[PDB]
Write an enzyme that holds these catalytic residues in place. Structure first.
Site, PDB file in Angstrom:
ATOM      1  N   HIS A  73       0.823  -1.203   0.000  1.00  0.00           N
ATOM      2  CA  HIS A  73       0.000   0.000   0.000  1.00  0.00           C
ATOM      3  C   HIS A  73       0.864   1.263   0.000  1.00  0.00           C
ATOM      4  O   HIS A  73       0.354   2.367  -0.158  1.00  0.00           O
ATOM      5  CB  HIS A  73      -1.003   0.012   1.175  1.00  0.00           C
ATOM      6  CG  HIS A  73      -0.422   0.449   2.482  1.00  0.00           C
ATOM      7  ND1 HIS A  73       0.052  -0.439   3.424  1.00  0.00           N
ATOM      8  CD2 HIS A  73      -0.245   1.685   3.008  1.00  0.00           C
ATOM      9  CE1 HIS A  73       0.495   0.230   4.474  1.00  0.00           C
ATOM     10  NE2 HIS A  73       0.326   1.521   4.247  1.00  0.00           N
ATOM     11  N   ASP A 113      -0.256  -7.353   1.910  1.00  0.00           N
ATOM     12  CA  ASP A 113       0.306  -5.990   1.937  1.00  0.00           C
ATOM     13  C   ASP A 113       1.828  -6.037   2.122  1.00  0.00           C
ATOM     14  O   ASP A 113       2.373  -5.584   3.126  1.00  0.00           O
ATOM     15  CB  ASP A 113      -0.348  -5.188   3.074  1.00  0.00           C
ATOM     16  CG  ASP A 113       0.071  -3.726   3.089  1.00  0.00           C
ATOM     17  OD1 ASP A 113       0.422  -3.177   2.017  1.00  0.00           O
ATOM     18  OD2 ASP A 113       0.033  -3.122   4.184  1.00  0.00           O
ATOM     19  N   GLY A 160       3.223   6.905   8.661  1.00  0.00           N
ATOM     20  CA  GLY A 160       4.596   7.234   8.328  1.00  0.00           C
ATOM     21  C   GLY A 160       5.533   6.075   8.642  1.00  0.00           C
ATOM     22  O   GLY A 160       6.672   6.034   8.166  1.00  0.00           O
ATOM     23  N   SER A 174       4.484   2.970   8.072  1.00  0.00           N
ATOM     24  CA  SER A 174       4.078   1.944   7.116  1.00  0.00           C
ATOM     25  C   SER A 174       5.261   1.422   6.305  1.00  0.00           C
ATOM     26  O   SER A 174       6.153   2.185   5.906  1.00  0.00           O
ATOM     27  CB  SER A 174       3.003   2.486   6.166  1.00  0.00           C
ATOM     28  OG  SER A 174       1.756   2.629   6.840  1.00  0.00           O
ATOM     29  N   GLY A 175       5.264   0.114   6.070  1.00  0.00           N
ATOM     30  CA  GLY A 175       6.340  -0.500   5.317  1.00  0.00           C
ATOM     31  C   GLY A 175       7.537  -0.814   6.198  1.00  0.00           C
ATOM     32  O   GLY A 175       8.408  -1.582   5.803  1.00  0.00           O
TER      33      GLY A 175
HETATM   34  C1  LIG Z   1       1.295   3.936   7.267  1.00  0.00           C
HETATM   35  O1  LIG Z   1       2.307   4.496   7.947  1.00  0.00           O
HETATM   36  C2  LIG Z   1       0.070   3.682   8.262  1.00  0.00           C
HETATM   37  C3  LIG Z   1       0.481   2.939   9.566  1.00  0.00           C
HETATM   38  C4  LIG Z   1      -0.690   2.772  10.535  1.00  0.00           C
HETATM   39  C5  LIG Z   1      -0.311   2.064  11.833  1.00  0.00           C
HETATM   40  C6  LIG Z   1       0.094   0.592  11.680  1.00  0.00           C
HETATM   41  C7  LIG Z   1      -0.213  -0.024  13.043  1.00  0.00           C
HETATM   42  N1  LIG Z   1      -0.955   1.034  13.801  1.00  0.00           N
HETATM   43  C8  LIG Z   1      -1.483   1.974  12.780  1.00  0.00           C
HETATM   44  N2  LIG Z   1      -0.961   2.916   7.497  1.00  0.00           N
HETATM   45  C9  LIG Z   1      -2.121   3.454   6.978  1.00  0.00           C
HETATM   46  O2  LIG Z   1      -2.473   4.640   7.089  1.00  0.00           O
HETATM   47  O3  LIG Z   1      -2.813   2.471   6.292  1.00  0.00           O
HETATM   48  C10 LIG Z   1      -4.046   2.895   5.666  1.00  0.00           C
HETATM   49  C11 LIG Z   1      -4.651   1.712   4.952  1.00  0.00           C
HETATM   50  C12 LIG Z   1      -5.966   1.448   4.886  1.00  0.00           C
HETATM   51  C13 LIG Z   1       0.827   4.897   6.182  1.00  0.00           C
HETATM   52  N3  LIG Z   1       0.914   6.252   6.238  1.00  0.00           N
HETATM   53  O4  LIG Z   1       0.330   6.669   5.022  1.00  0.00           O
HETATM   54  C14 LIG Z   1      -0.044   5.518   4.369  1.00  0.00           C
HETATM   55  C15 LIG Z   1      -0.700   5.674   3.055  1.00  0.00           C
HETATM   56  C16 LIG Z   1       0.204   6.200   1.973  1.00  0.00           C
HETATM   57  C17 LIG Z   1       0.488   7.597   1.882  1.00  0.00           C
HETATM   58  C18 LIG Z   1       1.337   8.086   0.855  1.00  0.00           C
HETATM   59  C19 LIG Z   1       1.915   7.183  -0.101  1.00  0.00           C
HETATM   60  C20 LIG Z   1       2.792   7.749  -1.166  1.00  0.00           C
HETATM   61  O5  LIG Z   1       2.975   8.982  -1.230  1.00  0.00           O
HETATM   62  N4  LIG Z   1       3.361   6.849  -2.050  1.00  0.00           N
HETATM   63  C21 LIG Z   1       4.224   7.259  -3.140  1.00  0.00           C
HETATM   64  C22 LIG Z   1       3.444   7.896  -4.310  1.00  0.00           C
HETATM   65  C23 LIG Z   1       4.437   7.766  -5.399  1.00  0.00           C
HETATM   66  C24 LIG Z   1       4.494   8.491  -6.597  1.00  0.00           C
HETATM   67  C25 LIG Z   1       5.542   8.204  -7.510  1.00  0.00           C
HETATM   68  C26 LIG Z   1       6.519   7.194  -7.207  1.00  0.00           C
HETATM   69  C27 LIG Z   1       6.452   6.461  -5.987  1.00  0.00           C
HETATM   70  C28 LIG Z   1       5.399   6.761  -5.091  1.00  0.00           C
HETATM   71  C29 LIG Z   1       5.099   6.145  -3.758  1.00  0.00           C
HETATM   72  C30 LIG Z   1       1.632   5.792  -0.011  1.00  0.00           C
HETATM   73  C31 LIG Z   1       0.785   5.308   1.019  1.00  0.00           C
HETATM   74  N5  LIG Z   1       0.238   4.412   5.033  1.00  0.00           N
END
Ligand SMILES: *[C@](=O)([C]([C][C][C]1[C][C][N][C]1)[N]C(=O)O[C][C]=[C])C1=NOC([C]C2=[C][C]=C(C(=O)[N][C]3[C]C4=[C][C]=[C][C]=C4[C]3)[C]=[C]2)=N1
Ligand SMILES: *[C@](=O)([C]([C][C][C]1[C][C][N][C]1)[N]C(=O)O[C][C]=[C])C1=NOC([C]C2=[C][C]=C(C(=O)[N][C]3[C]C4=[C][C]=[C][C]=C4[C]3)[C]=[C]2)=N1
Ligand SMILES: *[C@](=O)([C]([C][C][C]1[C][C][N][C]1)[N]C(=O)O[C][C]=[C])C1=NOC([C]C2=[C][C]=C(C(=O)[N][C]3[C]C4=[C][C]=[C][C]=C4[C]3)[C]=[C]2)=N1
Ligand SMILES: *[C@](=O)([C]([C][C][C]1[C][C][N][C]1)[N]C(=O)O[C][C]=[C])C1=NOC([C]C2=[C][C]=C(C(=O)[N][C]3[C]C4=[C][C]=[C][C]=C4[C]3)[C]=[C]2)=N1
Lengths: 243, 243, 243, 243
Positions: D44, D91, D192, D194-195
Site C-alpha cells: 500500500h 500488503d 509514516g 508503514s512498510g
Molecule cells: C502507514 O504508515 C500507516 C500505519 C498505521 C499504523 C500501523 C499499526 N498502527 C497503525 N498505514 C495506513 O495509514 O494504512 C491505511 C490503509 C488502509 C501509512 N501512512 O500513510 C499511508 C498511506 C500512503 C500515503 C502516501 C503514499 C505515497 O505517497 N506513495 C508514493 C506515491 C508515489 C508516486 C511516484 C513514485 C512512488 C510513489 C510512492 C503511499 C501510502 N500508510
C-alpha cells in the site's frame, strides 16, 4: 459577529454583501447602501492595490447568504487616497453600482449623520454582518445575517486599552482620530463583517456612525473593535455621493 | 530567502534563529548578535503585545535548523516604543540573553554602522535567513541557512513603485525614511526571515544596514523588500547595548 | 455529483441527507427513504464502528442543504454484519426513524427492485446527491441537489478496467458480485454522495439499483463508480423493513 | 512511533526510508534491508496502482531524516499480485536497488524468520520508524528515528478485539491469517511507519516478524497494530530474493 444573534428580516434593510469571483461568488466583506446607487465600505476590503471590477458584485439585503442571490455589477471602485492600511487610517471606500436600486420597505438606504453628530460614549449601537461568530470560527450554513448591540467607547479610552499589555509607548497613537470604537469581550464584529455598518438610533432615526475596520482579534480583553468614523469623511463621501 | 543558495559554514557568524515554544521549539523569525548579551531583531517578531519570556528562546548560528540545537533563554525583550505595525515603522527590537555568549570564528557579533552611513544603490549587500524560498513555499528540510545578494535602491524609487497599481495617492508616503529598500523579482527575503540581518561590505568591514521587515509578498513586480533602516535607530540601541 | 445539473424540485422524492452533530448539523452522507420509518444508506457512512445515535440526524428531501432544515432523530442504526470496508463489500445499512414520515408527492419512498432485476448496460439510470462536483471540489453554496445520468456497464467490464495500470493480478476480483458499476470520465458521483440512491426507470417505475459506495477518485480514467448492488441484499433488508 | 523514544545510533542498521519526488524527496513510508540489494516494505506504500520509478528513492539508516541524505535509485518495484487493499491482505512488496549496498556494522540487512518460526503471543518485539508520534501529530524536527517495545498478540485475540464496538459480525474476519498484531493503547506504530519492520530477538538474533501495515488510528482502545506476517510470504520473497 460575536455574541448577538440572527436578525429579524425587517431589520437592517441597507446591509449588503460584497462578492468576489471564484468557484462561486463568495462573500468577502459587508457594506451599506447609503444612496440608491452607492455602497459605503472599508477600503482594505478592496485595496490598496487596484482591482478588476469584472470580478466584483454587490448583493443587497439577504436573510441567509447565497440562497436568493441577485448579484448587481459595480461600475466604480473609489478608494480613499490616504488609505494604505487599516491601522494607519482612512479605511473607507465607495462602490458605485451600474444601476440605482428600486428602494422599498425591505431594501433601502441608511442615513449618514450630520458633520455635527458625535455619538456619546456608552451609546447603544448595532453592528451587523455575516462574519465569523468568533476568532477563526466561521458562521455556519444557512448563513443568517447577525446583529449585536455594542456600546460606543471614547476614542482615548480605546487607545488607552490598546496600550495595556503592549510595548507601544503610551503617547504613541494606536486608535487614531478618524476612528471610532465599540464592543467588549462578549459583543463584537469579526472577520467577514469588514466594511459593514455600525448604526445608532438618534432622536428616533438610524445613522451610520461607523464602518467595520480592524481590531486585534474579536471581542478580546482590552481590545475593542475599531471603526472608521463616518462623520470624519462626510466631505470626501459627498464629493461623489449626492446629498 | 528567495533566489539564493545554501550559505557556507564560515559566513554570517552573527545570524540567529528565534524559537517559540510548542510541540517543538519552532523558528518564527531571524535576528543578529550585536553583543555577547544582545540580539537585534524586528519589533513585529515579538510585539506589539508583551509575550511570556519563558516561551521564547534563541538559537545561535546553525548550518541547518533543529539538528544541532543549543537553545538559549532570554531575560529581556525590548521593543522600540514607537512600534505598532511594520508599515507604520520603527520595526526594531532587542533581546537580552540571560548569559553572555563565548565568541569565536563560527559565532561572533556583527558590526553596527556609523550614524552617517548611507548605503547607496550599486553597493551590493546580502540578506540571510531560513524563510520561505518563494511566496507560500517553505524552506524544505534539512533547512539550510540561505543567503542572497540584493540590489539596493533609493527610498524614493521604491516608494514610487509601491504606488504603481495602487489607489494610494502618490503624495502619501509608503516607504518611510526610517526604512531601507532592497531586492527584486528574483532576489528577496520572504516570510520567516523577518528580524534577520541585511549586511553590506563597506571598507572591508561588514555592517548591518537593515533588519528584514515587510513587503507585499516576496520578489513581486514593483514591490521590493523593505527593511528597517538601522542607522535611524542607533541612538535607541545604545540606551541598552554598550558601545 | 460530477458532470450533472441542478435537479428540479419535483424529482427524487426519496433522496435524503444524513447529518452529524458539530458546530452545525453537517451533511456527511446521502440516503433514501424506502419506508415511512426506514432509510437506506451505505454501511461505510455509519460504520464499521458503533456510533452515538443522538449525534446523528436525518433530513428529508431538500432543494438546498441547510436552508429549510427539519431534522429527524434516529432510533436505530442497522449495518450489514458482513461489512468492514467498502472495497471488500456489503456496503449497505438501515436507519430506523423514531417516528414515521407522512408521505406526499414531494416526499415519498423509492421502489426497491425485484430479486431478479439486472439493469444491463443501455439502461436509463440516474444518481443524485450533494457531494463534490469533482475531486477535492465541494458543492458550492447554496448547495443544490444535483443529478446526473450515468452509463451502466457490466461488472466484468469494470473489473478489467480497475486492473489497468495496476499491479493487482488479473484473476483477483476488484469489482465484486454484490457490486454494480456506472459512470464515466464526465459523469460520476463523488465524495459526499456516499449512501445515496442510483435509480433506473424500468417499465414506467423507478427502482433503486444501488447505493453509492466507492471508487478510485471520481470520473477518473478506467475507474468507473462502484455501487452496492441492492438486488443482492433484499433478503437482509426485509428482515427489518416490512414488505 | 507512539510511546517510544529516539533510537541509539547503533540499533536497527536495516531501517530504511522511502522517498517520493516533489519540492524535496519527502519520506512517505519505511522499509527494511533484507538483502544487499533488496528492500522489504508494504504494498500500500507503492500501489496498487503502478508508480514511476524515477520518482522513487531509498535512504538508509539515518539518525535524523533529511540530515545526511544519500538517496539511492530503485531499479524495480515488485508488488504482490494478490494485493488491492491493506484490510484485504497481501500488503507486502519488494524494492530492488540499482546497486548492492556495502554492509557494515552501521548498515546491514535484518534476517527473515524461518518458515516454521512462530512468534509466541507476548513476544518482546520492536517496531521502528519516523511516523507520527500520535494520531494526527507528526514527528517534530530534527526527525529522530524512534522505536518502541510492542507485545505481540494472538491473531484470534486481535480479531476479537476489533469486533468490540463494531457492527461487523463475530464470525467475520477482520484480522486475517496473513496478518499479525502487536501493541496497545500506549505503544504502537503510526502514519509514516508503514512498510517499516517489526523485529523480535529470537535465540540471540533479530528476525523481522512483520511489516507495518494498518489499523484503526494509533494506540486506540481495542485497536492494536496490524502487520503483514512475513513467514506467510516467505516463498514469494525467496522467489526474488536470494539466500
Ligand atoms: C502507514 O504508515 C500507516 C500505519 C498505521 C499504523 C500501523 C499499526 N498502527 C497503525 N498505514 C495506513 O495509514 O494504512 C491505511 C490503509 C488502509 C501509512 N501512512 O500513510 C499511508 C498511506 C500512503 C500515503 C502516501 C503514499 C505515497 O505517497 N506513495 C508514493 C506515491 C508515489 C508516486 C511516484 C513514485 C512512488 C510513489 C510512492 C503511499 C501510502 N500508510
Ligand atoms: C474584516 O472583517 C476584519 C474585521 C475585524 C473586526 C472589526 C472590529 N472587531 C474586529 N478586519 C480585518 O481583518 O482587518 C485587517 C486589517 C489589518 C476583514 N475580513 O477580511 C479582511 C481582509 C480581506 C480579505 C479578503 C479580501 C478580498 O478577497 N477582496 C477582494 C479580492 C478581489 C479580487 C478582484 C476584484 C475585487 C476584489 C476584492 C479583502 C480583505 N478584513
Ligand atoms: C517576516 O519574515 C516577513 C518578511 C517579508 C519579506 C521581507 C522582504 N520581502 C518580504 N514579514 C511579515 O510577515 O510582515 C507582516 C507584516 C508586518 C515575518 N514572518 O512572519 C512574520 C510575522 C510573525 C509570525 C509569527 C510570530 C510569532 O509566532 N511570534 C512568537 C509568539 C511568541 C509567544 C511567546 C514568546 C515569544 C513569541 C514570539 C511573530 C510575527 N513576519
Ligand atoms: C462517499 O461519498 C464517497 C463516494 C465516492 C464516489 C462513488 C462513485 N465514484 C466515487 N466514498 C468514499 O469516500 O469511500 C471511501 C472508502 C472506500 C463518501 N464521502 O465520505 C465517505 C466516508 C465517510 C466520511 C465521514 C463519515 C462521518 O463523518 N460519519 C458520521 C460520524 C458519526 C458520529 C456519530 C453519529 C453518526 C456519525 C456518522 C462517514 C463516512 N464516503
Amino acid at each position: 459577529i460575536v455574541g448577538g444573534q440572527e436578525a429579524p428580516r425587517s431589520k437592517w434593510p441597507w446591509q449588503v454583501s460584497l462578492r468576489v469571483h471564484g468557484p462561486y461568488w463568495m462573500h468577502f466583506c459587508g457594506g451599506s447602501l447609503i444612496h440608491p446607487q452607492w455602497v459605503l465600505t472599508a477600503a482594505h476590503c478592496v485595496g490598496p492595490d487596484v482591482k478588476d471590477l469584472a470580478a466584483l458584485r454587490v448583493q443587497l439585503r439577504e436573510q441567509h447568504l447565497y440562497y436568493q442571490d441577485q448579484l448587481l455589477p459595480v461600475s466604480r471602485i473609489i478608494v480613499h487616497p490616504q488609505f494604505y492600511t487599516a491601522q494607519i487610517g482612512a479605511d473607507i471606500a465607495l462602490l458605485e453600482l451600474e444601476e440605482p436600486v428600486k428602494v422599498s420597505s425591505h431594501v433601502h438606504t441608511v442615513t449618514l449623520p450630520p458633520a455635527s453628530e458625535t455619538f456619546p460614549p456608552g451609546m447603544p449601537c448595532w453592528v451587523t454582518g455575516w462574519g465569523d461568530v468568533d476568532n477563526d470560527e466561521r458562521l455556519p450554513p444557512p448563513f443568517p445575517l447577525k446583529q449585536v448591540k455594542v456600546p460606543i467607547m471614547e476614542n482615548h479610552i480605546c487607545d488607552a486599552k490598546y496600550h495595556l499589555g503592549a510595548y507601544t509607548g503610551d503617547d504613541v497613537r494606536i486608535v487614531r482620530d478618524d476612528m471610532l470604537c465599540a464592543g467588549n469581550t462578549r459583543r463584537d464584529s469579526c472577520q467577514g463583517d469588514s466594511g459593514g455598518p455600525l448604526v445608532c438610533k438618534v432622536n428616533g432615526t438610524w445613522l451610520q456612525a461607523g464602518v467595520v475596520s480592524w481590531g486585534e482579534g474579536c471581542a478580546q480583553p482590552n481590545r475593542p473593535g475599531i471603526y472608521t468614523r463616518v462623520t470624519y469623511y462626510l466631505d470626501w463621501i459627498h464629493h461623489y455621493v449626492p446629498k
